[PDB]
Design a binder for this molecule. Structure first.
Ligand SMILES: Nc1ncnc2c1ncn2[C@@H]1O[C@H](CSCC[C@H](N)C(=O)O)[C@@H](O)[C@H]1O
Ligand SMILES: Nc1ncnc2c1ncn2[C@@H]1O[C@H](CSCC[C@H](N)C(=O)O)[C@@H](O)[C@H]1O
Lengths: 242, 242
């Protein structure tokens, strides 16, 4: 029911239910299951396994009454954040907010002074696909009837928005910002808000050297020993215990 | 919950949630709301208002315990029938079947001996869009996780399949066969199975002269005075009371 709803939402968001093909820049269920393409029209690129991970983490924080809001840093068309809001709706949770943090202009051009690994990737060149306006994201929330007071937006570059984001505590921090600098700025500003029992999800860890660098360096610097658990061929997560 | 699920299902089936454009043979919400286009990819052409009518009728027969199975005669990609099965699932109804009746080859070519109104329309020429195989319909049910024992298929021309269909009683009869002959063959064979309290839905009444002819003639012949109620700019329905 809530369970039928969330099951269907995952299938709709990833576009498996309507066999949404990969972006011009075929549909293969095995590829979509692991989030290994960019859907032409669907609302998230993270795939079924990473959507299921969001569901499991958010349901666990609700079931264990771990305090805090939910956030995604790097949202594209908004589908992962739509799922977060839908899970709250399914469980009639009225006292948590979903924070939708993005430039709404794609990946920054890190320039000559960027982290070497970020410069080498030149991921801003992918902005023809990766830049999605806030108006489009809002419309996507409205399409699911989920644009309401429990959704809040943090538009701008993370280095500008996250230090002053008016978030008190976080139960789930989902990071999907593609660069060393984006990931570092997310962890430095938002990890201290994560409650004990809460989760940090790293979208692109195994196959993204600069993202792997940022996560490992932050964890080493702050002696975070909570183990990284895999999700699929790309993502990992951990639960904060201390 | 069941209600969140069914709300989302209607939006997914019609393709409003992902703004599915009209078939090559733009997306406009007002057009999709009234079922006035053929979606490029979505699973039904009947639109939001006609999907909502199915929901209301099926929920009413469940809530009033009107006996019988559910059937659609003319299914295209299967979306109206997927909704019927989903409503049963949402309410944990295990003792009704959804019957999916179609040629799976599009509209018949009525030939020189067809009803004059059917011959003039030459709707078989639209089969490039209207012919959808049973394999495709089955796959669509599977995409929603709704292909199970409570879905049954009646493949073939209605004149061949309906006289011997092993249906005992019907709580909802949804007719969407586009022709005088299709509509007449549906009513003659299946209306006698409709329980008191059950519903007959006519997809294409107001703007389809041959369909209007068949429904009105059948109702006049059998003295059916239960009033026709409108749905949108096209469909009507009635409830059997006697
Ligand atoms: N430093 C930064 N500041 C703001 N937005 C950033 C950023 N680095 C990356 N982004 C954003 O990160 C996103 C990467 S794609 C995110 C995919 C999304 N989680 C999904 O469910 O499909 C883009 O929307 C991009 O604009
Ligand atoms: N005499 C007949 N026998 C079998 N199938 C028929 C028929 N006349 C029309 N059809 C079928 O009627 C359908 C019309 S389109 C139906 C639309 C569908 N109800 C929806 O939800 O989108 C086609 O699939 C066509 O194959």
């Amino acid at each position: 029911d809530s369970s039928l709803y969330l099951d269907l939402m995952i299938k709709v968001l990833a576009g498996t239910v309507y066999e949404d093909p990969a972006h011009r820049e075929t549909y293969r269920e095995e590829v979509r299951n692991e989030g290994r393409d960019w859907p032409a029209n669907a609302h998230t690129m993270i795939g079924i396994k990473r959507l299921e991970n969001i569901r499991q983490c958010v349901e666990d924080v609700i079931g264990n009454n771990v305090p805090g809001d939910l956030v995604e840093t790097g949202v594209w068309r908004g589908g992962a954040c739509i799922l977060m809001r839908g899970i709250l709706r399914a469980h009639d949770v009225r006292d948590r907010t979903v924070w939708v943090a993005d430039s709404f202009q794609g990946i920054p051009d890190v320039g000559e002074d960027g982290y070497a690994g970020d410069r080498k990737m030149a991921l801003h060149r992918r902005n023809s696909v990766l830049a999605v306006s806030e108006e489009e994201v809002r419309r996507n929330f409205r399409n699911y009837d989920l644009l309401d007071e429990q959704v809040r937006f943090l538009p701008g570059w993370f280095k500008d928005t996250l230090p002053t984001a008016p978030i008190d505590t976080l139960a789930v921090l989902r990071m999907d910002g593609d660069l060393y600098e984006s990931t570092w700025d997310t962890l430095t500003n938002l990890y201290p808000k994560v409650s004990v029992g809460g989760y940090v999800i790293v979208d692109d860890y195994m196959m993204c050297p600069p993202c792997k660098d940022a996560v490992d360096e932050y964890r080493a610097k702050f002696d975070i020993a909570d183990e990284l658990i895999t999700i699929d061929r790309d993502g990992v997560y951990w639960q904060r215990t201390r």
